[PDB]
């Protein structure tokens, strides 16, 4: 991992997903690391981002 | 989660939520079940996720 961090651009960032309300810019829910979510939770996020 | 609860009894080091990653890795600890941590809360100090 380290020898990726030190020489490759796209390994210097952690990615995260957030949910925002139309009527409010306040976070409704944001997820990264320790998903702790059912299998069905994953596949939605997957398909939508892709 | 029900199956995870049962699995804590039969195993030396049961891998919780295994079927989420097709056999790759486990995501959840043991304590969060006791704490009833309903997913990862929002970063605005949260406390609504436990």
TrEMBL record, chain B:
Instruction: State the signal peptide span.
Output: none
Q: Which amino acids does the record list as binding ADP 4? A: 1, 32, 41
Amino acids binding ADP 3: 28, 32
Which amino acids does the record list as binding ADP 5? 28
Annotated positions binding ADP 1 = 1, 27
Q: Look up the domain of life of the source.
A: Bacteria
Positions annotated to bind ADP 7: 1, 28, 32, 41
Any idea which positions bind ADP 2?
1
What protein is this chain from? Chromosome partition protein Smc
Organism of origin is Escherichia coli
> Which residues of the complete protein does this chain represent?
51 to 100 of 1095
């Amino acid at each position: 991992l380290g020898a990726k961090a030190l020489l490759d651009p796209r390994f210097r960032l952690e990615f995260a997903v957030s949910v925002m309300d139309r009527q409010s810019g306040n976070v409704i829910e944001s997820r990264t690391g320790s998903q702790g979510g059912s299998g069905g939770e994953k596949e939605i996020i997957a398909s939508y981002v892709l | 989660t029900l199956v995870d609860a049962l699995m804590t009894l039969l195993c030396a080091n049961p891998r919780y939520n295994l079927a989420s990653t097709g056999g790759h890795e486990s995501d959840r600890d043991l304590i969060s079940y006791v704490r009833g941590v309903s997913g990862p809360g929002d970063g605005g100090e949260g406390q609504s996720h436990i």
